[PDB]
Amino acid sequence: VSTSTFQTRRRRLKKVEEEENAATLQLGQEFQLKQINHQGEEEELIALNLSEARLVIKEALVERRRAFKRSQKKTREKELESIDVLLEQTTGGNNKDLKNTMQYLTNFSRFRDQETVGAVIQLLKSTGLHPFEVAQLGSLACDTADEAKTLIPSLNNKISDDELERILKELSNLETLY
Amino acid sequence: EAGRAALYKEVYNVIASDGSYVNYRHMALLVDVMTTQGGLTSVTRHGFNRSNTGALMRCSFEETVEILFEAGASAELDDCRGVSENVILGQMAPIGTGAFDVMIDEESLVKY
Amino acid sequence: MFFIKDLSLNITLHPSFFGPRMKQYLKTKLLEEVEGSCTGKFGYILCVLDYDNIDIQRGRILPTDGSAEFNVKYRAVVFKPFKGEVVDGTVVSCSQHGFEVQVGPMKVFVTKHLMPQDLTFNAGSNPPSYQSSEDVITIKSRIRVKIEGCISQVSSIHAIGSIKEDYLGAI
Amino acid sequence: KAIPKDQRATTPYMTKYERARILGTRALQISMNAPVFVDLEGETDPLRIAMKELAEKKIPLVIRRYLPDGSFEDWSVEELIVDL
Amino acid sequence: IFVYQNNITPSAMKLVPSIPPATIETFNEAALVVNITHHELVPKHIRLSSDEKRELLKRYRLKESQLPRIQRADPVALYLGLKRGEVVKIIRKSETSGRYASYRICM
Amino acid sequence: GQQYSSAPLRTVKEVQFGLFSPEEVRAISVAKIRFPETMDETQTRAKIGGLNDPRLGSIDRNLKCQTCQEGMNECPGHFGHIDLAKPVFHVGFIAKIKKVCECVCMHCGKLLLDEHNELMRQALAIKDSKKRFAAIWTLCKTKMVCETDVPSEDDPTQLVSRGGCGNTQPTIRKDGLKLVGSWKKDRATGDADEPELRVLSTEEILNIFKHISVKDFTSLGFNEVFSRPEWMILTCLPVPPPPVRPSISFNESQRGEDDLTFKLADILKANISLETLEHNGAPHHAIEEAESLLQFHVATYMDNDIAGQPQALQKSGRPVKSIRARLKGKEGRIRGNLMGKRVDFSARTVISGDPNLELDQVGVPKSIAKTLTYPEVVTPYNIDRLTQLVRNGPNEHPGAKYVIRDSGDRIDLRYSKRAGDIQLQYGWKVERHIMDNDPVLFNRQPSLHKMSMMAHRVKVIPYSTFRLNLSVTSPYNADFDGDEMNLHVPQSEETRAELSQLCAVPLQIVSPQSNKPCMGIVQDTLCGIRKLTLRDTFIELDQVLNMLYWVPDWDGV
Amino acid sequence: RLVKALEDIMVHYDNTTRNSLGNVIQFIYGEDGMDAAHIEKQSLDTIGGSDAAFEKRYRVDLLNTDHTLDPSLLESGSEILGDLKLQVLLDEEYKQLVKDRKFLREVFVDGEANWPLPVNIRRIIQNAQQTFHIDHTKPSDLTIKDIVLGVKDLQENLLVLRGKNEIIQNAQRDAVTLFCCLLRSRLATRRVLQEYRLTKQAFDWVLSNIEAQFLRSVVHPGEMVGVLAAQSIGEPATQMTKKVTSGVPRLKEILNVAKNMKTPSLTV
Amino acid sequence: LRFGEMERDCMIAHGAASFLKERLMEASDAFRVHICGICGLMTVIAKLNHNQFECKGCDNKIDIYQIHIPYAAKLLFQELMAMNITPRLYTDRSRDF
DNA sequence: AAGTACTTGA
RNA sequence: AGGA
DNA sequence: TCAAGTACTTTTTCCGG
Numbered sequence A: 001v002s003t004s005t006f007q008t009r010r011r012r013l014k015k016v017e018e019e020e021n022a023a024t025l026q027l028g029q030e031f032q033l034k035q036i037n038h039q040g041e042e043e044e045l046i047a048l049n050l051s052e053a054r055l056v057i058k059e060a061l062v063e064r065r066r067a068f069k070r071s072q073k074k075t076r077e078k079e080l081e082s083i084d085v086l087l088e089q090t091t092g093g094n095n096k097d098l099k100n101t102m103q104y105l106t107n108f109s110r111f112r113d114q115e116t117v118g119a120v121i122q123l124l125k126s127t128g129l130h131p132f133e134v135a136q137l138g139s140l141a142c143d144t145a146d147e148a149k150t151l152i153p154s155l156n157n158k159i160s161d162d163e164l165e166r167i168l169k170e171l172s173n174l175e176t177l178y
Numbered sequence B: 001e002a003g004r005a006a007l008y009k010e011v012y013n014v015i016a017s018d019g020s021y022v023n024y025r026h027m028a029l030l031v032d033v034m035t036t037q038g039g040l041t042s043v044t045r046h047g048f049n050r051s052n053t054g055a056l057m058r059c060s061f062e063e064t065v066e067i068l069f070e071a072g073a074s075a076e077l078d079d080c081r082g083v084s085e086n087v088i089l090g091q092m093a094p095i096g097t098g099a100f101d102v103m104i105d106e107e108s109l110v111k112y
Numbered sequence C: 001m002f003f004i005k006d007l008s009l010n011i012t013l014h015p016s017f018f019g020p021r022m023k024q025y026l027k028t029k030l031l032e033e034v035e036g037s038c039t040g041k042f043g044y045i046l047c048v049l050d051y052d053n054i055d056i057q058r059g060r061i062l063p064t065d066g067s068a069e070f071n072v073k074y075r076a077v078v079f080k081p082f083k084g085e086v087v088d089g090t091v092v093s094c095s096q097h098g099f100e101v102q103v104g105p106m107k108v109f110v111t112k113h114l115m116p117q118d119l120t121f122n123a124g125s126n127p128p129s130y131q132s133s134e135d136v137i138t139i140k141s142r143i144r145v146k147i148e149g150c151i152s153q154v155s156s157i158h159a160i161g162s163i164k165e166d167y168l169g170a171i
Numbered sequence D: 001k002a003i004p005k006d007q008r009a010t011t012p013y014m015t016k017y018e019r020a021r022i023l024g025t026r027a028l029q030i031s032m033n034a035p036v037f038v039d040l041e042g043e044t045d046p047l048r049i050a051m052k053e054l055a056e057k058k059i060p061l062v063i064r065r066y067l068p069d070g071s072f073e074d075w076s077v078e079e080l081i082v083d084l
Numbered sequence E: 001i002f003v004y005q006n007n008i009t010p011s012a013m014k015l016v017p018s019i020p021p022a023t024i025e026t027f028n029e030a031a032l033v034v035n036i037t038h039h040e041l042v043p044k045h046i047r048l049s050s051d052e053k054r055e056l057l058k059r060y061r062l063k064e065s066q067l068p069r070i071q072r073a074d075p076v077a078l079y080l081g082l083k084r085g086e087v088v089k090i091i092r093k094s095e096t097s098g099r100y101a102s103y104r105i106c107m
Numbered sequence F: 001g002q003q004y005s006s007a008p009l010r011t012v013k014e015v016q017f018g019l020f021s022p023e024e025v026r027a028i029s030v031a032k033i034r035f036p037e038t039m040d041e042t043q044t045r046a047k048i049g050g051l052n053d054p055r056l057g058s059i060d061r062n063l064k065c066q067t068c069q070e071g072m073n074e075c076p077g078h079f080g081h082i083d084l085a086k087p088v089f090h091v092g093f094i095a096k097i098k099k100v101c102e103c104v105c106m107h108c109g110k111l112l113l114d115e116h117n118e119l120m121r122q123a124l125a126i127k128d129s130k131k132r133f134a135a136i137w138t139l140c141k142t143k144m145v146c147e148t149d150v151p152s153e154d155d156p157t158q159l160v161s162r163g164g165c166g167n168t169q170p171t172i173r174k175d176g177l178k179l180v181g182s183w184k185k186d187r188a189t190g191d192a193d194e195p196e197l198r199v200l201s202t203e204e205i206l207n208i209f210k211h212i213s214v215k216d217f218t219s220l221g222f223n224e225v226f227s228r229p230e231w232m233i234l235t236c237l238p239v240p241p242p243p244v245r246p247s248i249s250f251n252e253s254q255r256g257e258d259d260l261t262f263k264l265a266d267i268l269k270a271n272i273s274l275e276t277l278e279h280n281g282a283p284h285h286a287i288e289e290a291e292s293l294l295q296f297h298v299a300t301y302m303d304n305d306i307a308g309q310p311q312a313l314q315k316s317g318r319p320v321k322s323i324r325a326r327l328k329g330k331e332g333r334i335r336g337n338l339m340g341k342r343v344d345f346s347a348r349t350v351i352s353g354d355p356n357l358e359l360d361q362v363g364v365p366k367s368i369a370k371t372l373t374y375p376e377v378v379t380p381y382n383i384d385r386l387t388q389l390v391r392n393g394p395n396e397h398p399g400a401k402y403v404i405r406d407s408g409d410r411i412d413l414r415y416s417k418r419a420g421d422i423q424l425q426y427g428w429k430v431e432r433h434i435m436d437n438d439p440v441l442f443n444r445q446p447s448l449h450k451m452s453m454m455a456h457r458v459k460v461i462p463y464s465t466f467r468l469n470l471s472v473t474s475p476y477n478a479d480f481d482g483d484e485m486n487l488h489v490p491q492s493e494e495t496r497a498e499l500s501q502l503c504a505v506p507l508q509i510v511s512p513q514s515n516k517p518c519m520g521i522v523q524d525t526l527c528g529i530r531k532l533t534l535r536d537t538f539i540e541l542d543q544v545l546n547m548l549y550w551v552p553d554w555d556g557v
Numbered sequence G: 001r002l003v004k005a006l007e008d009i010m011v012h013y014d015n016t017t018r019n020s021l022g023n024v025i026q027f028i029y030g031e032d033g034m035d036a037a038h039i040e041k042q043s044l045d046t047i048g049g050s051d052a053a054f055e056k057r058y059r060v061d062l063l064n065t066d067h068t069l070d071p072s073l074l075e076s077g078s079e080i081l082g083d084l085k086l087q088v089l090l091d092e093e094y095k096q097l098v099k100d101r102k103f104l105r106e107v108f109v110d111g112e113a114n115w116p117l118p119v120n121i122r123r124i125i126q127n128a129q130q131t132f133h134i135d136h137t138k139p140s141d142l143t144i145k146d147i148v149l150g151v152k153d154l155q156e157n158l159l160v161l162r163g164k165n166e167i168i169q170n171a172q173r174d175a176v177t178l179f180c181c182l183l184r185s186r187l188a189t190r191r192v193l194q195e196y197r198l199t200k201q202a203f204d205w206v207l208s209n210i211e212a213q214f215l216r217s218v219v220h221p222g223e224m225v226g227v228l229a230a231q232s233i234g235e236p237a238t239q240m241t242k243k244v245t246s247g248v249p250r251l252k253e254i255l256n257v258a259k260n261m262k263t264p265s266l267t268v
Numbered sequence H: 001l002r003f004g005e006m007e008r009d010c011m012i013a014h015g016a017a018s019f020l021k022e023r024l025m026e027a028s029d030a031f032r033v034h035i036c037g038i039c040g041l042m043t044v045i046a047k048l049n050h051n052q053f054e055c056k057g058c059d060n061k062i063d064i065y066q067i068h069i070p071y072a073a074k075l076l077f078q079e080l081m082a083m084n085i086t087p088r089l090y091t092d093r094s095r096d097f
Numbered sequence I: 001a002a003g004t005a006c007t008t009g010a
Numbered sequence J: 001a002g003g004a
Numbered sequence K: 001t002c003a004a005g006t007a008c009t010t011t012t013t014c015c016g017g
Ligand SMILES: [Mg+2]
Pocket: F478, F479, F480, F481, F482, F483, J004
């Protein structure tokens, strides 16, 4: 038995169209802008920029270690070793995917602190860009508005070159000095 | 309405004639079932068995293949509410014992 | 990219577990199945969030067998790669055919042909490298790739990518 | 849709069928080495163990009673009256 | 209501639905010599208001399908001048309960 | 014994009826199904890549299925296909096809009547997908002309144009599997006198049906997804897998192919004659001759008992069994295999009454208890008892026949080299003999009552008869002039609870049938009870003391 | 045919009787909402006899020296004579009894008194007597309010439908109508005191038992009443052997809704 | 022995839903098929060992359920299909009512 | 043993 | 071909 | 346009060669 979602669609006989997935912001059925949380409320898609994602997983696993011991009652190269310890505590080991993921996010995060990831999130979620672009902007370090508009082709007419270049300047200033 | 009253009277008479006794409710139900349609619905293949109940249910009495062919042709959807469908599917029919559901409550479980 | 997704897994607990550490067993079983999982539908199910608030709901007792069935409604961090996505990653494998790049839980492979012409395979190096007039792409090197396409495969997602277009390549 | 506890209107008493199915279920579970919520005062038959559990309303089961429309009222075996 | 003696020609019968929102009824004098409603077997039928029906359906969680049906042409459905969708509350005596109330929707 | 499957287990919540599109038949098809030859790869005993397993299900028992692997008990069949040389009517739909022609234009595929006719918009309004079609037909059958212009929804002076085509509509009648029309004509305003007489071809009807609008056909019975009208005409024929038409393989080198296997070969053969006939120098009559026969075989395969006399008799005289015949009432599929079933854990013998049995008990012969078995799960409560029953074996009375491990496989205590040294593990199942006080469903046929099937306590006894208390005689309607009764043994703790808690004999005493008790004192006991209770009847101490001891619940006073 | 026609009919959790379509057949099972197992032929004393004898049995007139309850019957007897407010309760009571009589006579037109009803009241009283060793000599410790009101109360708890709304509440009243005529006929003040000679405790116990018994007597949602009904007619049909076509062939004629019937006849 | 239609009736009369199921399934017929969630047919090429599921002509290697029905019913369904009728089996609802 | 549906001449 |  | 015969339909308790 495998996992299901909030998206209730009734595929009665009519198989296809399973249209291409591209950053023409044409993500899956599952990765649609208008999602629905378990409470039934319409909620927007949550896209994480690697720095933002590292903090989420870390937080989750940290709070897990907490309950795991509660129920038991009755500098990057340094964050890497610290995380590798938490995984050997909270995760069922076999999940080699999460171990690599954590190391990747640890060696690839742009913003180390929650304070830092805070400001990034405000700055970006003022643009009205789609969660995917807002994430790609935080996770990919660009200088020319062209670097960004090329790498994130979805952006093309969505923002001023100058506006994007103003953002890119402020994203670089937030960049954690490792 | 008077059709129902006569229908019972007449049915009741067959039983009491033999000198037997059947409780009202039974005879009422049959008489009511024949009646609810708006007229006199015969307890025959061309009567009751030609109502809007499920194909599999209806196919279990008198016109089998013909019923199933029509089901196919007009894309009929069996609710699977009838006893008969569940007997055909090998499922717990929504009959007495199966007219409800049983769940474990983790809350009450940890209470005891 | 890298999403937070609301999901639900149906678990079938045998009666021997209808004791007090039932929720505990269920929550643990969810993580066993779901965590580390990989679908094409949702991608890599990496980390189940908010363990302390996983919604077990009531379990319906399956009729002929004693076991009960719960729909364990939860929320997790997923990684679903797409075509057109630009990704940063570290090289892993490197041959006369191309080089594979580790990107979080998945590997994106770059063909000798999805690379610029100048960058050519140098077999004579420990370990094998790719050499441009300016760059040296080898096992530990950090690369920026444009995912050309993905192949949904069992317990993974594999993809092809280019470093041929502008703003892609060595970092 | 699920009728709220303060709006339920089905018998506050347990139906013949409910009881039979509860006992059958607990008996099956007990027989499948499930944890028993009462002192087996020498008891060995899982049905007699189940009757003992239902006797002390120490059964952690809930009857979901479906209405013809599809809605339902959930009733605990602890709360249902057993006048049967 | 047109209480006709012997017959209404098919020419004249074409004018019956020709003037809505008004409604027209044709009754053969002979049928009305005796009031059927007065008969032993014929119980009290009561027409329900749009609100009364809406409520009946709400209270029993019903779709109109699920209600027992009275035919539009039914002797009492005619006497009362029932229209399609209108509901009758039939209050009958019971050897079982004393008084039993059934309902019928029109055809 | 079926194996573990990762697939989530669910219940059938809805059955969605419909028709097969030729495209679907071709899609789901695991093979085609080109040669009438069953097997013998040029006499070499193994299936031919032509009929039965050209990738389909499997024979040989040994030798796994070629598409899935599973083999025999696990592998359901796999469907195949045969592309038909010419389209052919599905027997069951001939009249529905006729009626649809009767409703539509046999040239443009437009409904003969529409929203312009009042009686039509009235009939179109009908919600019931069958009653609406019934009323549409009665109206449109009469309309013998496809109208170009019809009077406006006001004036008969200004005639508004609906759909085109003028064409006179044929007067259709059936000629057993063939639909033949009779077009009214014109010739000097009269004619008919002598009209146009030609048969409507499957292919032309198909083409007309293909052109019928979704809105139009949806107004008729039909549904655009599961049952388009064009689907009552067969282009691609689904070939049922061996499980449907199994070869009764008597001995080694001897076939025994099913009727359906032969009837398909007939169809297949009839198809190849037509296929080659038309691809070659088509002698045009010899073609409509070869076509008609394919129509016959595809017809009789589904329904053999047709109005139009020939009964497609197998060379043996005996007519071929139709698929319709299989499903057809009492004995056969629905009624015989599904509403009713032959069942395991059932027993039957002669019944005889016992004045020494309790009302709710049933005397079971030792032999019958030694055969019937209950699957008991090894629990710490029963562990020691069960180990002894196991030790006792299948031949002693309180014994057991099998031990089923958690690890699937079933130990036959009758032959197992380890029937002695066998340590039970919790969770394992012991199949023990039916024992005193087990609940069992006892029944006397016909079964016109819920009381014709009541739950009793086992009492294992000698002698080959089921023994019953006399007062329980009446509900069953049994007597001892040689009556026989059926016994069914529950297998679940759950199932027993149903018997004991709902259908046990004492519960069944006061019946709702007549709101009075359906059991009382009979024969000897009734005859004696009068004799005993007269004013004249007095009993001496000696017998009083015996009569008192005889009451098992006697206070001792 | 009877079976296959009725198979899918059963009592639902809303006391309604529906098929596989959820189409209502009966609004309440067998018009009364009771399980036939828990029903017994009982006598409705109110229906028959002389208007005179009814009066003798049921009438209490505390304002008449010859129609008061004798102080031998209850302790209150002496202090009860002339109590105008109490007479308002005995008038209420007697008015309702006369109401019932006329109603019952509308229902059972021939005056047939014996009808199958739930709760054998005769037996509850019989049992109350041996249970409490009722002294047919000493006066009762019951008040008129104890009797009159206690019965009025018991009636409110004789639940068959539960819903909080007019439709369902009116439905409950209807379903319980007849049982209460029986109840009121058997628990009228004079009757309780003069006939049964019940004490307050005996009376309280009779009331509690009627209640408990009545509640037990209601149909169980899940009850497969369709097959039941079908078999309850089917089985007796099996034992079957002016001159009108009757027995097996008339029953045959009926179920077929046979147009060209064998013996058509009017009774003018 | 035969647990016939009339025997089925008495069991329905009693409300013994599970006992009835048991007679028709465990005590007789009972079989396991793999069905497709798109076109509710027995089409699934369940290579249950290698864990492959598939229903080519749906291209559905994913949305696949397993079901327990009497082998006679599996048969009936195959028979109805052979006769061009599609008895599509669905594990969820759409109508409500 | 009695029907439903369809077709035939006044 | 028989049995209730 | 509508009566009357036509086609043609369908069931029938339970259990050894
Ligand atoms: Mg006999």
